[PDB]
């Protein structure tokens, strides 16, 4: 048995919106410390890592560890049948090939109950090992999104150059080229051990920025020749972290 | 000769949005007492019945009774050329193969005239006879629409079960199942009300209920009426004018 | 060498929205007095004429007179990467095949630089000679846009009839016919309808092309229509303190 109640159910709505465009199917690892999900996209270019701590739920019971295999597209569809003000409860039995999602309306008079079929996934999960990065940029999440959106009209790749003054994003294609230059000050903050220059697929960054509604800020972490880390904090619950292999 | 000026024209915009997705062509029955329209959809699963009383109009003249045959798609397109605050007047002359719609802007300086061609339809109109129902549910129209919309992502059919505490809507398909449970509001401030002679359980096509909820902008509330083995009635009041009523045959094997 | 800074960069955003749906590529004629662009659509039905005076810019430098060939579609796409509150600067170096667009954000911490490739166009520009028109109508730009939009659901052509009382727009097609009748206003000057009639006129024009013109609507509260028998309609939007955007449309036969 597993039972997690979340009063701010919107959070879970946004989490699913943020994932289903990158991943069709993933394993939800439940345990006593909370919910963890970790998965590559189907092109093996990126990895996504989700953490929701048990203590961020309003109540949380997990008696045994569970690897629930979930169609994220299905789950997101069910979560659309939830009001943005609904109270959301997830419930699974020990054996079970189904996950129950229960939506309680603010007015108390409406309760919806969805039983979602699970699926069997063989995800022996590996991850990116923890490390310290040459460059770490903290900035408004909406600003980052607009940058990735703008440049994706110019080319399919973005070169990210981090010096000390600031950081520069540039792209190039059929219709010319563009670059966007950000300086240290809603604040923009930069922590530079050493300069770095990397090239990434904009297609994948625009998937990541679907997490924008979860957080005011976003953190980009870079070193030479290793995956970019794009991280959104989910306040008082955990984080959503995306890793993107550099282009060659 | 026929002339009706409306209490407010948006109402007629909403009526036509509410119909054109269900019916292509219908008869508008005009008389002294007002406007009546009654029609099955083309798959003969449902019936729609519209009543607009003369006394709900601002002025209303009908010297002879008319069955005006209307392309509802066309009429809805013309009504899109009307502002939501426009005053709307329908007009038909004695020898009418055309219906005139006249839109007067609030500022008085813009007047539009549209002449829509009619057609001859041989609608010998049958209807559901009046009756009392085992179950009658009154609820916010928007809540009902959201229910039908939500469940239509789960399956193509909804089982509606009415007991006394409350009413339950459920569906089932590829991706699992769902149900939605509604209770009576005792302590109102948006109320949900239930009148149960005897319990009932029926199954209906969601595709058709989602056509009906296109009437939602007409009314804050909606009334569902049920008995065993007979059409669901879904009714929106058009307050002080009349009503839009849908009937939906139950599903079987 | 050419450099024009515009604090209200939104203006330029709207100008390009207003053009790219009618013209793929055009010549920007730069000089000391400002920016002039003049071009036919590719079906040679209409002409568009843009004027932006140097004095309307916040700073403006043009050392020599220049015909820059621009993909308007490209330029509009780049201008979408500009915030609606950004400061916008255009820059062409001496002898360059590229136009630089530079966007400065209100917060000062973001600066974007886009370099657009230019192209060589052989536009020996012809224009409509200046004249006085039998009929001149000034009216709210949004009202005009709604008229063209409404009537384009009835037919592909609009007959415009100007008498003295007022002006009438009408159309006709499959689903019937429609006409819209506007009178002079005896609140504002940004809600008034004004008519100057030397002599009555009646012309017929393609609605498809009027609905391209009304993409300029966000530039101006008002629009001016100028007509005489057998000559192009002129539809004009003032760009306040800067210039104008003018569209000409050949009459239908």
Residue numbers in the entry:
A (entry chain C): 1 to 185, 193 to 255
B (entry chain E): 1 to 189, 193 to 256
C (entry chain A): 1 to 186, 189 to 255
Give verbatim lines from the article.
Cellular responses to replication-associated DNA damage are centred around Proliferating Cell Nuclear Antigen (PCNA), a DNA clamp that acts as a processivity factor for eukaryotic DNA polymerases. Structurally, ZRANB3 belongs to the Sucrose Non-Fermenting 2 (SNF2) family of ATPases and contains several identifiable domains and motifs, which provide specificity for a number of defined substrates. These include the amino-terminal SNF2 ATPase core, two PCNA binding motifs (the PIP box and the APIM motif), a specific type of zinc-finger (Npl4 Zinc-Finger, NZF) and the HNH nuclease domain (named after the three most conserved residues). We have previously identified ZRANB3 as a structure-specific endonuclease that plays a role in the replication stress response. We further defined PCNA as a key regulator of ZRANB3 function, which recruits ZRANB3 to the sites of stalled DNA replication and stimulates its endonuclease activity.
Our structure of PCNA:ZRANB3(APIM) shows that the APIM motif occupies the same general binding site on the PCNA surface as do canonical and non-canonical PIP boxes. The 310 helical conformation is stabilized by a network of intramolecular hydrogen bonds; however, whereas in PIP boxes this network does not seem to necessitate conservation of the constituent residues, in the APIM motif it involves a conserved basic residue (Arg1074 in ZRANB3), whose side chain nitrogen interacts with the backbone carbonyl of Asp1071. The most notable difference is the absence of a glutamine residue otherwise conserved in canonical PIP boxes, whose side chain forms both direct and water mediated hydrogen bonds with PCNA2529. The APIM motif contains a glycine at the analogous position (Gly1069), and is therefore unable to interact with PCNA in the same manner; instead, it forms a main chain–main chain hydrogen bond with Ile255.
